[PDB]
Design a protein around this ligand. Sequence first.
Ligand SMILES: O=C(CNCCO)NCCO
Length: 478
Amino acid sequence: AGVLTIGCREDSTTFDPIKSAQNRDTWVFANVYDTLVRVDNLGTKMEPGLAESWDISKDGLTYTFKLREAKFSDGSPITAEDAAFSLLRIRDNKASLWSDPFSLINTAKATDPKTLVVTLKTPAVAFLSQLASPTVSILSEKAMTKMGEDAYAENPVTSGAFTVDEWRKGDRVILKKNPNFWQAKNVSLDGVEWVSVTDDNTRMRMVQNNELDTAIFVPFSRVEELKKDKNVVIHSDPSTREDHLLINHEHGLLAKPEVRQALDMAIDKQSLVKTATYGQGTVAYSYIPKGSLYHYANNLQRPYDPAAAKKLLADAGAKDLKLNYVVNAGNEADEQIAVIIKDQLAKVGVTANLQKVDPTQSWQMLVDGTYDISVMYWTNDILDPDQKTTFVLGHDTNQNYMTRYKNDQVKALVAAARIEADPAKREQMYIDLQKLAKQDVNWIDLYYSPYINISRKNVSNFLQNPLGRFTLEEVVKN
Ligand SMILES: O=C(CNCCO)NCCO
């Protein structure tokens, strides 16, 4: 009691925001640190965070933030030098996964402890939306310098509602209420535990047996029956989520656009999404999630056409194509989808060999390239297409969501669209990016879907906002 347990799937890897692009981390330390700006619960606008106000230069190059009075968890104050230190290591640290979107930072300096001044190399409208991401969580410069970044990442001094009280790697992360948080008065919970439970049904049974207060990732097959269960509440929260089939373009004949186009034409999207998501998903046709900024509703959907897929593969030397399909065991959708894709690809002479793995282990296999195809997903945590575009199409250190997709026109277009000042031309550039990615088959878009989570009836205000952030500060456990 007083502690909210949350069953999750993938487990924490770090509390240093620059070192992870995964929700197993960002959804956890989003309630551990605070940010200069925040996004409201409906994901529509920016709101004050650690910064109570801000002003932008006329030349759009100087961003000045007025910090409110706030403390870190260790009692020390939150100063503009702390924020300056945080922004700049995203740009400059060797281990940062986000150097590319933050390469446009000329300087960040504190003119005085309350005032932060960031100047960019060129204007970029996304910069303010960027400051709401948990990636720009404000860390304590003094203590990072004191402890070093390796120890800080395992027991941080935090600026948000909770501290990391203990961390059993691969098992659970136990957060304790931070009494120095500037909104600590609003925080009812004494603590939060993220418990990794990699089997969907086991996670659900644990909620229903009162072994967990809440869980994320309700398996689609059970949403309907659980909605009728009086002891629990299914949440279906508006999201920026999209699921997709990754393709490793480095792996032989998968480099040929025709082979990837053939795979796209051999997978019946409507049938797949209806069967595997039990009607909860919406067929996806663009890498930008439907409802998010610049989403292009008339992007190409290749109709199911196995005859043309067979000819494309034959013309390309890939008639007998065999694929290493990495599958996350215990992820019901992942498993169901793999059976459908395997069955459908077999109709065009393609053999998908399923390799079932621990869901906590597959991401590293994507990074290392030890896969031909594998389903994964993405959620935005800012209100701008530049974050997903850079990770998925930017040709940055992440290798285009680990596909190794390469298109020189796209790489340049991503950088141009970032700094485009004309909003009407910026929109057209993100439309062309959705078009070009689809022409090339960077990956196979599968479906959009809400966040579907579950909580026992006594838990109040267990909302995940569209940017993935759980309103753990508003939660009341009755
Ligand atoms: O969706 C993401 C990151 N989402 C937060 C935006 O950076 N990663 C793949 C799933 O872990």
